[PDB]
């Protein structure tokens, strides 16, 4: 039975650092990327749309331009891992990874950003 | 390209009534039940899961208990509509119809609920 699992449904991270958030899906043999769809989003806001072997960078929310990537080697292990670099306060909230690979499921991940006083300022 | 489509991405409904919320996907010649997943949910609460060829209520949020149906019958025709009965004020918000069938897509629908003062005065 196809499910997506997260080893951590919550991450606490420091402002400016990098994070990698992970969804696991079953891969028993050679990854068939023609059958694989990985979608990552924070709102509403798209971060990854990986259909049949490539990103659709076209549709990615501006706020994730070049700070966000899916580690494609990790995919072969059944690990859709989104790495975000240079973490901002705006990156805090609910993420969703949706994966389809002979089955379909998704999981929710919550990200908290701790920041020093200097950084938090409106 | 695989796309889920919604005729109406806004519904307005009266407290106490039933509502049917439409969502459509393309079928080829035959529906392969085994490759169709449908999830309906609202604000990250599962309303319904259709996996394999069965309605699956395993993660159903209690709020929706016994008030939600998707018609197996109509899946053949590319129709994945959700039927909510006895609409509450707490049913208002953003719904998502998520569908894997060969490809994968989801679309959002906003639901507004009108109610009279007695019902609004839930309140508490
Ligand atoms: C819904 C889903 C997906 C959905 O993937 C997509 C969702 C939307 C979209 C649409 N996308 C949105 C941003 C703008 C560009 C583009 C468009 O509108 O043409 C693409 C994918 Br892939 C992927 C993997 C699994 C599931 C799934 C399906 C059923 C149950 C559990 C998960």
Numbering used by the authors:
A (entry chain A): 18 to 139
B (entry chain B): 18 to 141
Which passages does the manuscript contain on this structure?
The small-molecule PD-1/PD-L1 inhibitors of Bristol-Myers Squibb are based on the (2-methyl-3-biphenylyl)methanol scaffold. We show that they act by directly binding to PD-L1 and not PD-1 and effectively dissociate a preformed PD-1/PD-L1 complex in vitro. We further show that they inhibit the PD-1/PD-L1 interaction by inducing PD-L1 dimerization through PD-1 interacting surface. Not only the inhibitor partially covers the PD-1 binding site in each PD-L1 molecule within the complex, but the interaction of the two monomers fully occludes the PD-1 binding surface thus preventing the interaction with PD-1.
To assess if the observed dimerization is induced by crystallization conditions or rather is specific for this class of compounds we crystallized BMS-8 in complex with PD-L1. The crystal structure was solved at 2.3 Å resolution and clear and continuous electron density allowed unambiguous positioning of the inhibitor and all the interacting residues. The asymmetric unit contains two molecules of PD-L1 organized in a dimer identical to that observed in the structure of PD-L1/BMS-202. A single molecule of BMS-8 binds at the interface of the dimer in a pocket almost identical to that found in PD-L1/BMS-202 complex. The disposition of the buried part of BMS-8 is identical to that observed for BMS-202 and the only differences are observed in the part directed towards the solvent. Overall, the binding mode of the compound and geometry of PD-L1 dimer are identical in the structures containing BMS-8 and BMS-202 save for detailed interactions of the solvent directed moieties. The fact that crystals of PD-L1/BMS-8 complex were obtained in different conditions and belong to a different space group than those of PD-L1/BMS-202 strongly advocates that PD-L1 dimerization reflects a specific mechanism of action of BMS compounds rather than a crystallization artifact. PD-L2 was characterized by a comparable melting temperature as PD-L1 (38.2°C), however, neither BMS-8 nor BMS-202 significantly affected the Tm value (38.6°C and 35.6°C, for BMS-8 and BMS-202, respectively). These results further confirm the interaction of both tested compounds with hPD-L1 and indicate that BMS-8 exhibits lower affinity compared to BMS-202. Differential scanning fluorimetry employed here to evaluate the BMS compound selectivity between PD-L1 and PD-L2 demonstrated that both BMS-8 and BMS-202 are specific for PD-L1.
